[PDB]
């Protein structure tokens, strides 16, 4: 929900080594790397954002500091209610264990309480497809059923906001439409969605407003069509 001028940094080693005379000298060998910059970003609920830009911009380290998997050095971050997104899915999988006993894991550490899993719990596995595998180990599913898996309970997961990493992009056919659907329900209640693409023009179709990222700073905000247009410029004067 409110990013609150964030910033954050990582150190880094010129050269493995410098890592080894930290400590054996005590003293750094490291330079201080800033990844975001002053990051002031409001995500409201019941609308789309997306999020653009180039390879470092740092949109990865936004999301992590979103879903707070990673606190900022400087400023805050603040939200109603649980993010998810790609390193959510699946967490807690245990390939002895079967899909059905997996639903239940991973729906628990994505939020869900015991009761709303049993409520659910249906739901998630025909949306999987998965119904004649479900009491089966995962150790015994193809990658495409483990990730179905994990789709299907995640979506499921009544979150604030979803984060559409850039990679969750490929999927199989006519099951993304059914994840389509499932996120407009999302929107419809209030939820939020955060699409990071590098589809110019999926992002002018899907996106209420979006935000234009580079080397960690927001330099473009506001609708799809004024922030793609931005990153055309930048990429005619960047690399």
């Known amino acids: 929900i409110r990013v609150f001028d964030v910033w954050k940094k990582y150190k880094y080693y010129k050269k493995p ?16 790397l800033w990844v ?13 954002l997306g999020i653009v ?12 500091v979103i879903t707070g998997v990673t606190e900022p ?27 059905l006993e997996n639903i239940y894991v991973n729906a628990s ?16 596995i025909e949306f999987s497809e998965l119904d004649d595998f479900i009491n089966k180990p995962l150790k015994t599913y193809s990658s495409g059923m483990i990730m179905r898996l994990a789709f299907s309970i995640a ?19 006519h099951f993304q439409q059914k994840c389509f659907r499932k996120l407009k329900e999302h929107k419809q209640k209030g939820g939020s969605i955060i699409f990071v693409s590098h589809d110019m023009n999926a992002v002018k179709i899907l996106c209420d407003r979006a935000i234009l990222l580079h080397k ?18 930048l990429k005619l004067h960047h690399h």
């Open 17 to 32: 080594q410098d890592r080894l005379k930290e400590i054996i000298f005590r003293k750094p060998f490291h330079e201080e």
């Open 36 to 48: 975001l910059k002053g990051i002031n970003l409001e995500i409201e609920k019941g609308e789309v």
């Open 53 to 64: 830009g180039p390879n470092g911009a740092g949109k990865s380290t936004l999301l992590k």
């Open 73 to 99: 050095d400087k400023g805050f971050v603040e939200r109603s209610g649980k993010v998810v997104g790609l390193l959510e899915l699946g967490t807690g999988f245990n390939y002895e264990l079967s899909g």
């Open 109 to 124: 550490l994505l939020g869900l309480s015991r009761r709303e899993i049993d409520e659910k719990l249906e739901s998630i």
């Open 155 to 173: 979506i499921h997961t009544e979150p604030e906001c979803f984060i559409i990493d850039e990679a969750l992009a490929v999927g199989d056919a």
């Open 216 to 233: 960690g700073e927001i330099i473009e905000e506001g609708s799809p069509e004024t922030v793609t247009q931005a990153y055309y410029k």
